[PDB]
Amino acid sequence: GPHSLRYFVTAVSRPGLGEPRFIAVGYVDDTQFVRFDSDADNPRFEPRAPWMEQEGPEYWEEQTQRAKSDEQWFRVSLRTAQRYYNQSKGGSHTFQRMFGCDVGSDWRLLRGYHQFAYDGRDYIALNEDLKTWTAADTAALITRRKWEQAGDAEYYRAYLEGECVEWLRRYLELGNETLLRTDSPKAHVTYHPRSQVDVTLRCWALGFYPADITLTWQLNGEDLTQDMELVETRPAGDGTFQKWAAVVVPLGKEQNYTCHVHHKGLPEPLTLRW
């Protein structure tokens, strides 16, 4: 089956307060498994999932040292970034990196990532061919130019196709009990009085993993014309996720509405009437 290994890295400069905030989190699919927090009393990569606690000190020391090295790079990059743009000194700014690998069911690199954002906007990204770069603007062009000449594409392709995919395999083994599961959603509709003519119908999907889900309403079978509310999928706190979708329907007309739920853990899609 399809799986992914992702790191989400964040650095925030804080002038007058000390060195920048630096945090990296690691995910396999929708399950977090490692972290680095520069404000922690002792800065080190540490496990954030039960199945990672068995790893040897060599694992943790190499992870910690690769992160501390990345942190340093971010300090320079924040400074370099502020100069490239000609921004005012003294302000707080953000740098983000996302990298990792998606593999398909034939254990094959569907997509490798090495991309950056400055102040919440795209900066530079390694294209899908793992050979070329996309610069978001004339500042990033300077960086693209340097990374082209230095051969950074090949350096990270080697990582993306090797270490990344090789250790994704290992993580899936370590946590097979939890990672390879499909918790189906428990679904139900709730009824909430609004006005003297309308009423709210809310369709709930709870307790499911992975986080991808499809939740909608339809009237008699065709798509909606009204204005459905569909909230962001959200973590329950225990490794499962929640979502709901709501519609405002005419009193007396509630039976023409159905809620549909599609999920990887549902051998049949759900159809709920109130």
Binding site: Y7, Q63, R66, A67, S69, T80, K146, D152, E163, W167
Partner: peptide, 10 residues
């Protein structure tokens, strides 16, 4: 497994 140490600068 974290990415290997950066080689080029921004």
């Amino acid at each position: 497994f974290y990415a290997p140490e950066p080689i080029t600068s921004l």
